[PDB]
Design a protein around this ligand. Structure first.
Ligand SMILES: CCCCCCCCCCCCCCCCCC(=O)OC[C@H](COP(=O)([O-])OCC(O)COP(=O)([O-])OC[C@@H](COC(=O)CCCCCCCCCCCCCCCCC)OC(=O)CCCCCCCCCCCCCCCCC)OC(=O)CCCCCCCCCCCCCCCCC
Ligand SMILES: CCCCCCCCCCCCCCCCC[C@@H](O)O[C@H](CO[C@H](O)CCCCCCCCCCCCCCC)COP(=O)(O)OCC[N+](C)(C)C
Ligand SMILES: CCCCCCCC/C=C\CCCCCCCC(=O)OC[C@H](COP(=O)(O)OCCN)OC(=O)CCCCCCC/C=C\CCCCCCCC
Ligand SMILES: CCCCCCCC/C=C\CCCCCCCC(=O)O[C@H](COC(=O)CCCCCCC/C=C/CCCCCCCC)COP(=O)(O)OCCN
Ligand SMILES: *OP(=O)(O)OCC(C)(C)[C@@H](O)C(=O)NCCC(=O)NCCSC(=O)CCCCCCCCCCC
Lengths: 274, 88, 128, 104, 178, 459, 175, 124, 70, 63, 84
């Protein structure tokens, strides 16, 4: 039950994040997907690996939210990525910190997120589990790469899209130092902690070569597919959305129905009968 | 925050600036009191596009009931000044 | 060719999709004028009391008083025993009680029978 | 109460009410903090169908994956001392039936 | 917000509102500025070919089908300005807005600081006290019999007069008090 | 035990001979001294009891109730000082006399080593509270509330008198010690079933049980502030106390006769918690919260396990303190707005921040937030119920959920949002009201450090 | 520590490895514990020396109460209220003492589980067994008496248990 | 995986159930049957208190690795021969498990062929 | 606590040399770390031990007798 | 100077109080402070007894 | 102490449709016989430091050159130091 709950959580939350426009909402769904992966690790009887992932995710997700807040503050309280244009050169330190955080989140080799997510995918691949939970875990990893691409591309790469009066400013030592401490964390803490803790589980020493490369292959496929599909937005054509986009944007319609049907049917009765 | 305290002069300068990039209006003719419907020969849709441009310029949204009945650049400036509470 | 929107109780029909606002009639305009007039007299009264410098209390709202009195104190004088009310009251006031009684009685009968049989494993069950 | 005009100058801006107008019998149920009936882009029935279908499909395929598990081409792990008898429960005064592991 | 509502919306107002909504949701759909400009001009052209439709009946069948079209293509997550009723900072500073009458309940030791402010405040209160007895009479003499018909307030027509019901419009707390 | 009774009786000439402007000060000071004196009773011993004399005795169940009863009177005086300002001196003295007589009867009620004396004082407490409700009450519904409160209680209590005299005539005694030592089982019979009912219904009316709770919203909404304080804090607990005393003679009939009341309490806790969510009156909401908590106490007492009784004692003390504090906060709002509807005055945190933090702490204690003693009682009753039957956790969890819901709903509705524009008579909180809230809440958080003081005789 | 009895709360002899460093790189743990000692343990030790000599300057004793044994509820007449009172008080005292014994055994069990590390499932079998025995005995003595427990109810429970035992033994002997 | 494809789409009876393997006697292949060896004893493996799942046939290398890590603490990269030795022993153990799986599969195939040939001979 | 930066109104904002060097230095640090670790620990991303081929194993190794023993 | 006085009043005094309370009050009672026994490996010697744990079985060392 | 430096608005005649994607928008629009009236209002987004774009891969490889140089010199130094 823990494995199934984690798998469905990570997949559904990655699916929701793939199409959100609020940067904070995107990072929140990223956190939800990572927690789902954590309990997926719990379900395959690997608690210490889940704890290590907790420790790594702390660093890089905290710094991702830090950079998001920097962007929001420098753009006069603007959260939507549609009014976020070319900030790659306007805000260089936030740009590099967000790039490093997204690379660590997407499990770039030898990055804080490598030493936990890599082994989590290895362990779920080499275990007696569901086929469906495994499928959803891999698809969720791909979707993680995809929404990291979405954030970077729609917030840093194009032309500016914010109001004309530019108030962009990074030069405050508090913000810079606070960001760079978590940068150093996201770069070295994974290696340091993994090499400093005693071994508390049997490793997956020998695997088929394609199975060992599964995490990187899936992340790269997600990167490329998201990038290609995002580049199509420059095209001068307009099409109405599909049912899949509507489902993803409205969070699987879960907040709508579940926040209108039960509540009403409770409160109604709470006066009508009782 | 770190946002400057905009004033009437800046608001008026920005409104006239945005109006000047409207090629449907000859820049050398428009003034602060220039009516849109008559002094400039604009349409209703032209007026709603102008109100949209001002909104995107200043970063806030004007309600339709208040937007539909703003007909001079000075009128827009005074509406923005009332909304932002800028006395000087 | 666009699929139509079907309203529901918790997802209502938008105003811009209401045929009523497009079925314009002079009596519709009369009704709208009366509604705006009613709102206008009410707003004038509220603002006249509201901006008074001599007022140092609460502007009483007869509508709010009517709402609260109807919600609490007007119920019983307007209650009549009808098939609907009687059946609904009997159901919602008795059914849960007997349902829960049956559930807990069945559980405790099973537990007592298992205890008398001795196959329950109450080991370390000290604090009760 | 959520779908009232947010731009009108109400006497109660948060509740979106005017002094004097009749109050809905269930005002405290619609207070913008609770159930709202504002129109949605998608119809209620369509949303119900899609959400129910997604959840049912996920449940079905999780059960299917339960029926058809996934594993590696390996045998069970071998543990030295009578399947680690003494370290799991103990009972060292019973002399368990010896189980030994075959070397390949 | 400021302007009074009318008894209804005319055809032109509804069409203008639809044009505004369609352009905003189109801008939400096509993100980049060049794409938005191209498709907004296409939209304006599509909005213009029936500008001269003379009779009301087909001009009402039109702008009705357009509403269904918009509701089908409305981009369920439109961009919202941060301070707009849907925005992420809609009422963020609403808890910092303290009424002015609270100043009357301050301790005298608190009013010992800021003496100039409270002198000016007393002047404002005196002005309001006189103006109110003037404005009640003005509003009584100007209102038509049977009560007001709209939410419109006449201005001050005399020299020493002030607009009726001005105190709670000019003594607003601020847009961002803190 | 006379060292507490005699000063409380001397409180009356002290009030009647006081100067016209010193009655409140003298009453508060000397009632506080009595509250200090009562703390000595808290020194209980693990064996039988503190048998002071043939007429009075103290126990680990009677002691916390006595301490709470003595502590409540200064708070009642402090709360009543304001709205009774325009009252003549004689009638203010009469109000204080009613409060003092109520405390005297309550003090004698818990000690009361014999059951008929307990009945007499238990019923004598009904007179001063009825006079308080029907005389110093604002609305026109105080008369109907007085009638309901009177007749529910008396219809419940008269069969108790009949059963008590019957029991004394059969067994020879009604002394609690002899009754406990010479206990004999109750056989399954119609006469025994009716004796059980006559013994139980008197205390089940005053808890109140679900279905017999109609008098409580009336008598709490329409009463003055001191009346509401004494009704919620102490007067609701009498029935609880009585049950803990009398169920020593009702076994083993209790196991089979408690099912209807167990079902009624378990379902009515959910029903009343749900009622609290749709409530346009603050006093009504607090009253229904009281109903829910006392339903949980009823379940505990009927289960009849050591953990049930410990949790019930803890929950009684905690709920008394919390409900008294909530009523005082609502009265602080009411004395400014004069409306007693929850939606009228909004955004009060912007205008009264310290009242807002008092509201927050009262909600958190009502919330059953650990490690507060509210949670201690809640959790002990829940554990005992889980041992009794495992599906009980469903109802208990649903109740805790809805309790959190309506507590935070009450906090957010009144303290948060935007203030009402037309209300401009929200004066800053007096020192009296802040002191009242502090004297309500500090003992709760102090009792969290020594829980055995309020866990009853089964600790 | 001489404060508590080692036999009541047993502890294994606490074997610890010697430090056998393999490299010449200085580890910061020993330096940190040395500075901690010099900077914390010494002043605390001096304060304790002062406090202990002050307490020794004023030495006085308190005693543990001794309770004489009294006839129990079995040799008490049906309505003899004084004998019943004394027997009941004695029974309550015995109940409290048994509660404390069970508490001691539980403390032993928890300490063993913490101390044995990863091999607790094997190395704490003795404590688990003795807790099982004590729990069974306590459960037989005191469970299901109710909130209104007394010596008479415990005696009745024991009497019905021994009726069951006598019946079972009689059936087995004559089987 | 391909084994899952073969078992869940082809004939299940020709492929092993991983939960019940082995299904055959261990002497069925050859009679010498050299036994597995365990280097870490009972008491000192207990005293290392590794883990219950870490007390397998590679326990000696893990004990040595832990001892090295304890001794050379600050230079946490000094124990590379020990970690490689432990990982290589784990690799050999996993390879032996794969060999057991393949042996079970091939004896199952041989048993199927033998029973089918016996049935054909009986029919003829 | 920082420095003074003035708005531009449709022009690129001011950039201090310090922020540019700090960003470039940290990017270079990340890339150098990745290359160094990869060079040093190629096996972690590739594996140290080849996967054996079950088909290659001979019949005698697993004890396979083609209906000859019994 | 500020850092020094801060580390005095915020780090040193609390650790003094906590160490006194643990060393002379908490550890006065049994089982209040329990430590997991340190790991014993082949080849270590024990401070209390001085003996050496016998080495392992000299497995075949190749690769 | 805030940012009060009397910022002056630039000239409004700098912004030109030429050399930007707005020119291509204009061409495609005139192909259907239309014109964009707000073209010059949005040219500032392509004018200054905003004129040049960076690819996604070019963004991810932000400081790869210095990192590669440091990696090469470090490995060369290690190679020299080891063979001794
Ligand atoms: C063993 C073999 C190993 C090899 C494996 C295969 C190798 C690779 C194969 C590649 C396969 C396809 C890859 C692309 C995926 C689709 C992406 C795409 O093109 O989206 C555009 C397109 C719609 O675009 P649009 O509406 O025009 O966008 C509007 C604008 O663009 C507005 O745009 P915007 O700017 O607002 O935002 C754009 C955003 C928004 O776009 C979206 O709308 C998002 C929706 C598409 C994402 C969904 C992908 C996976 C879904 C998983 C769901 C699990 C099962 C759920 C079942 C539900 C049942 C009800 O899109 C993105 O950002 C990128 C999307 C994600 C692509 C990157 C990662 C995907 C690759 C992973 C797929 C498989 C590889 C796994 C790796 C491991 C190998 C096992 O999406 C689709 O058409 C859907 C395609 C697939 C959906 C299938 C679900 C249909 C369910 C119907 C019912 C079926 C019967 C059930 C019976 C039930 C009985 C009760
Ligand atoms: C504003 C910012 C904060 C400022 C303050 C900063 C300082 C913070 C310190 C305060 C909180 C930190 C927790 C510290 C707790 C230490 C005190 C604790 O140990 O004492 C408790 C003891 O406290 C009392 O037990 C609880 C107080 C009694 C409450 C009775 C209420 C008083 C009358 C009020 C009216 C009653 C009405 C209610 C009905 C009952 C428990 O002690 P205990 O281990 O056990 O035995 C004491 C020592 N012995 C062994 C020698 C005997
Ligand atoms: C059991 C739960 C029973 C239902 C409880 C209903 C509570 C009634 C009163 C609640 C008060 C009303 C309220 O909270 O407001 C609705 C409020 C506002 O909605 P928004 O989306 O924020 O709207 C924003 C724009 N306005 O929404 C809510 O929070 C209500 C949510 C109701 C929860 C219903 C779904 C819970 C069901 C859980 C089942 C799944 C169990 C998980 C499986 C576990 C496996 C190990
Ligand atoms: C909030 C409203 C509550 C209304 C009252 C609820 C309590 C009702 C309980 C019954 C009341 C009378 C009990 C009598 C007191 C106990 C005495 C006793 O038990 O002795 C019995 C007497 O038992 C009776 O007489 C019972 C007769 C009942 C008469 C009044 C009935 C009242 C209504 C009955 C139906 C409802 C019962 C439950 C109501 C619950 C509340 C809704 C027999 O003794 P002996 O005859 O001497 O010895 C036996 C050998 N001959
Ligand atoms: O002079 P003005 O006051 O400015 O009046 C303006 C105008 C003349 C155009 C208008 O007010 C008017 O009077 N029109 C008369 C007839 C008329 O316009 N009838 C309606 C024409 S139908 C129409 O508007 C075209 C449909 C386009 C809407 C499709 C929505 C698709 C977008 C969905 C989101 C991307």
């Amino acid at each position: 039950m823990t494995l199934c709950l984690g798998a469905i959580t990570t997949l559904f939350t990655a699916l929701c994040a793939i199409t959100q426009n609020d940067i904070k909402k995107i990072v929140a769904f990223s956190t939800s997907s990572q927690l789902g992966l954590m309990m997926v690790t719990i379900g395959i009887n690997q608690p210490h690996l889940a704890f290590l992932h907790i420790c790594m995710h702390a660093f890089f997700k905290a710094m991702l939210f830090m950079c998001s807040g920097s962007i929001i503050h420098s753009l006069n309280d603007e959260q939507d990525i549609r009014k976020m244009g070319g900030l790659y050169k306007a805000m260089p330190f936030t740009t590099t910190a967000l790039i490093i955080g997204s690379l660590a989140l997407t499990g770039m080799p030898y990055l804080t997120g490598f030493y936990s997510k890599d082994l989590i995918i290895e362990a779920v691949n080499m275990s007696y589990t569901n086929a469906w939970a495994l499928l959803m875990t891999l698809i969720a990893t791909s979707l993680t790469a995809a929404y990291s691409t979405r954030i970077i591309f729609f917030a840093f790469l194009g032309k500016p899209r914010f109001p004309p009066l530019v108030l962009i400013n990074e030069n405050n030592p508090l913000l810079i130092n606070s960001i760079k401490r978590l940068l150093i964390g996201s770069i070295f803490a994974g290696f340091i902690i993994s090499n400093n803790i005693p071994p508390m589980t049997v490793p997956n020493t020998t695997m088929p070569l394609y199975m060992k490369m599964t995490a990187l292959i899936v992340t790269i496929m997600g990167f490329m597919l998201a990038l290609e599909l995002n580049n199509t937005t420059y095209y001068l054509k307009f099409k109405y959305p599909s049912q899949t986009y509507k489902f993803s944007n409205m969070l699987g319609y879960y907040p709508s129905i579940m926040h209108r049907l039960p509540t009403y049917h409770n409160l109604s009765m709470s006066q009508k009968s009782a | 925050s770190d946002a400057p305290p905009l004033t009437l002069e800046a608001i008026k300068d920005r409104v006239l600036y945005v109006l000047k990039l409207y090629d449907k209006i000859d820049p050398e003719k428009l003034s602060v009191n220039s009516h849109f419907m008559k002094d400039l020969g604009l349409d209703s849709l032209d007026q709603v596009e102008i109100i949209m441009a001002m909104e995107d310029e200043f970063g806030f949204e004007i309600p339709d009931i208040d937007a539909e009945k703003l007909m001079c650049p000075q009128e827009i400036v005074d509406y923005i000044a009332d909304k932002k509470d800028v006395y000087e | 060719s666009f699929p139509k929107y079907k309203p529901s109780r918790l997802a209502t029909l938008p105003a811009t999709l209401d045929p009523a606002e497009y079925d314009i009639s002079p009596e519709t305009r009369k009704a709208q004028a009366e509604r705006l007039a009613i709102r206008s007299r009410l707003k004038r009264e509220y603002l006249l009391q509201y901006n008074d410098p001599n007022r140092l209390g609460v502007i009483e709202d007869p509508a709010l008083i009517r709402w609260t009195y109807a919600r609490s104190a007007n119920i019983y004088p307007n209650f009549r025993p009808t098939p609907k009310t009687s059946l609904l009251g009997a159901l919602f006031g008795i059914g849960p009680l007997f349902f829960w009684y049956y559930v807990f009685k069945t559980d405790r009968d099973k537990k007592e029978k298992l205890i008398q049989e001795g196959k329950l494993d109450q080991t370390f069950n000290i604090s009760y | 109460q959520q779908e009232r005009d947010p731009w009108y100058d109400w006497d109660h801006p948060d509740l979106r009410l005017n002094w004097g107008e009749p109050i809905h019998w269930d005002l405290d149920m619609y207070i913008r903090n609770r159930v709202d009936t504002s129109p949605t882009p998608v119809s209620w029935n369509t949303m119900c169908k899609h959400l129910f279908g997604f959840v049912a499909f996920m449940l079905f395929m999780f059960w299917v994956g339960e029926i058809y598990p996934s594993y590696q081409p390996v045998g069970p792990k071998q543990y030295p001392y009578n399947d680690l008898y003494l370290e799991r429960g103990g009972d060292p005064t019973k002399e368990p039936e010896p189980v030994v592991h075959y070397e390949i | 917000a400021f302007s009074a509502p009318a008894a209804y919306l005319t055809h032109q107002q509804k069409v203008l509102r639809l044009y505004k909504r369609a352009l905003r949701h189109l801008e939400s759909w096509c993100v980049h500025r060049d794409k938005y400009r191209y498709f907004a001009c296409l939209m304006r052209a599509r909005f213009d070919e029936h500008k001269n439709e003379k009779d009301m009946v087909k001009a009402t069948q039109l702008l009705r089908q357009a509403e269904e079209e918009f509701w089908y293509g409305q981009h369920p997550q439109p961009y919202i300005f941060p301070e707009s009723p849907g925005g992420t900072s809609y009422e963020r500073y609403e808890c910092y807005k303290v009424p002015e009458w609270c100043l009357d309940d301050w301790h005298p030791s608190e009013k010992a600081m800021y003496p100039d402010y409270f002198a000016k405040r007393e002047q404002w209160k005196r002005l309001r006290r006189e103006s109110w007895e003037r404005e009640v009479k003005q509003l009584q003499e100007e209102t038509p019999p049977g009560g007001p018909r709209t939410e419109a307030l006449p201005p001050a027509r005399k020299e020493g007069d002030l607009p009726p019901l001005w105190w709670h419009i000019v003594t607003r707390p601020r847009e961002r008090p803190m | 035990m006379l060292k507490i009774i005699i000063p409380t009786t001397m409180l009356l000439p002290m009030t009647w001979m006081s100067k016209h402007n010193m009655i409140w000060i003298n009453a508060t000071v000397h009632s506080l001294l009595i509250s200090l004196i009562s703390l000595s009773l808290l020194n209980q011993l693990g064996e039988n009891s503190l048998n002071f004399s043939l007429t009075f005795f103290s126990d680990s169940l009677s002691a916390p109730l006595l301490v709470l009863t003595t502590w409540l009177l200064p708070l009642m005086l402090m709360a009543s000082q304001s709205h009774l300002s325009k009252e003549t001196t004689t009638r203010k003295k009469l109000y204080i006399t009613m409060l003092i007589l109520l405390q005297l009867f309550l003090i004698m009620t818990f000690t009361a080593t014999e059951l008929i004396l307990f009945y007499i004082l238990f019923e004598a407490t009904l007179v001063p509270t009825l006079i308080i409700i029907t005389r110093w009450g604002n609305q026109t519904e105080r008369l109907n509330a007085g009638l309901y409160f009177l007749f529910y209680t008396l219809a419940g209590s008269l069969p108790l008198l009949v059963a008590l005299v019957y029991i004394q005539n059969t067994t020879g005694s009604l002394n609690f010690l002899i009754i406990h030592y010479w206990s004999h089982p109750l056989s399954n019979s119609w006469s025994n079933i009716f004796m059980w009912l006559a013994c139980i219904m008197a205390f089940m009316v005053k808890m109140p049980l679900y279905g017999l709770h109609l008098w409580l919203p009336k008598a709490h909404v329409e009463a003055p502030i001191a009346g509401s304080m004494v009704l919620a804090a102490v007067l609701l607990k009498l029935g609880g106390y009585g049950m803990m005393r009398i169920t020593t003679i009702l076994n083993p009939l209790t196991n089979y006769m408690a099912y209807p009341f167990l079902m009624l309490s378990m379902w009515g806790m959910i029903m009343t918690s749900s009622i609290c969510l749709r409530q346009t009156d603050l006093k009504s909401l607090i009253a229904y919260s009281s109903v829910s908590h006392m339903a949980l106490v009823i379940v505990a007492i009927m289960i009849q396990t050591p953990w049930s009784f410990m949790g019930a004692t803890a929950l009684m003390i905690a709920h008394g303190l919390t409900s008294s504090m909530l009523f005082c906060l609502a009265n602080t709002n009411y004395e400014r707005v004069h409306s007693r509807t929850m939606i009228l005055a909004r955004g009060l945190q912007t205008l009264l921040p310290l009242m807002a933090t008092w509201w927050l702490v009262a909600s958190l204690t009502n919330l059953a937030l650990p490690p507060s003693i509210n949670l201690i009682g809640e959790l002990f009753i829940i554990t005992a119920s889980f041992s009794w039957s495992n599906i009980t956790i469903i109802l208990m969890g649903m109740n805790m959920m809805i309790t959190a819901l309506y507590s935070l709903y009450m906090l957010i509705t009144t303290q948060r949002g935007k203030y009402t524009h037309h209300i401009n008579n929200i004066k800053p909180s007096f020192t009296r009201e802040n002191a009242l809230m502090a004297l309500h809440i500090l003992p709760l958080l102090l009792l969290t450090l020594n829980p055995k003081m309020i866990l009853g005789p089964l600790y | 520590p001489d404060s508590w009895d080692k036999d009541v709360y047993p502890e294994p002899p606490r074997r610890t490895p010697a430090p056998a460093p393999q490299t010449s790189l200085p580890n910061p743990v020993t330096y940190l514990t040395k500075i901690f000692d010099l900077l914390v343990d010494r002043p605390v030790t001096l304060a304790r020396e002062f406090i202990e000599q002050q307490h020794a300057k004023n030495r006085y004793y308190y005693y543990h109460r001794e309770f004489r044994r009294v006839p129990d509820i079995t040799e008490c007449e049906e309505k003899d209220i004084l004998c019943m009172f004394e027997a009941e008080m004695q029974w309550r005292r015995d109940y409290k003492v048994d509660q404390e014994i069970v508490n001691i055994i539980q403390e032993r069990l928890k300490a063993c589980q913490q101390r044995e590390g990863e091999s607790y499932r094997q190395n704490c079998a003795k404590e688990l067994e003795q807790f099982t025995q004590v729990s069974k005995a306590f459960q037989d003595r005191y469970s299901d008496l109710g909130a209104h427990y007394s010596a008479r109810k415990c005696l009745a429970k024991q009497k019905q248990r021994m009726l069951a035992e006598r019946k079972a033994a009689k059936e087995a002997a004559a089987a | 995986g391909a084994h899952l494809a073969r078992r869940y789409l082809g004939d299940a009876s020709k492929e092993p159930d991983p939960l019940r393997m082995p299904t055959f006697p261990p002497d069925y292949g050859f009679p010498e049957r050299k036994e597995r060896e365990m280097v870490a004893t009972q008491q000192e493996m207990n005293d290392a208190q590794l883990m219950l799942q870490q007390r397998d046939y590679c326990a000696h290398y893990l004990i040595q690795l832990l001892k090295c890590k304890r001794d050379s603490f600050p230079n946490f990269l000094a124990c590379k021969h020990e970690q490689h030795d432990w990982d290589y022993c784990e690799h050999l153990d996993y390879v032996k498990r794969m060999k057991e799986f393949e042996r079970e599969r091939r004896l199952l195939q041989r048993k199927k062929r033998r029973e089918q040939r016996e049935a054909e001979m009986a029919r003829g | 606590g920082g420095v003074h930066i003035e708005p531009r109104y449709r022009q690129f904002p001011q950039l201090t040399r310090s922020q540019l060097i700090q960003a470039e230095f940290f990017s270079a640090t990340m890339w150098f770390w990745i290359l160094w670790r990869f060079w040093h620990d190629s096996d972690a991303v590739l594996g140290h031990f080849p996967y054996p081929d079950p088909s290659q194993w001979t019949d005698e190794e697993l004890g396979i007798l083609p209906d000859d023993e019994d | 100077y500020r850092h020094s006085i801060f580390a005095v009043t915020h780090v040193l005094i609390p650790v003094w109080i906590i160490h006194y309370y643990l060393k002379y009050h908490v550890t006065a009672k049994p089982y209040t402070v329990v430590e997991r026994k340190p790991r014993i490996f082949p080849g270590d010697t024990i401070l209390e007894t001085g003996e050496v744990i016998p080495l392992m079985k000299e497995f075949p060392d190749q690769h | 102490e805030h940012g009060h430096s009397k910022m002056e608005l630039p000239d409004y005649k700098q912004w030109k449709i030429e050399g930007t994607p707005l020119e291509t928008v204009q061409e495609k629009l005139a192909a259907r016989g239309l014109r964009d009236p707000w073209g010059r209002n949005e040219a500032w987004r392509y004018s200054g430091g905003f004129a040049n774009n960076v690819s996604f891969v070019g963004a991810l490889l932000k400081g790869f050159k210095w990192g590669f140089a440091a990696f090469v010199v470090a490995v060369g130094a290690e190679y020299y130091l080891e063979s001794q």
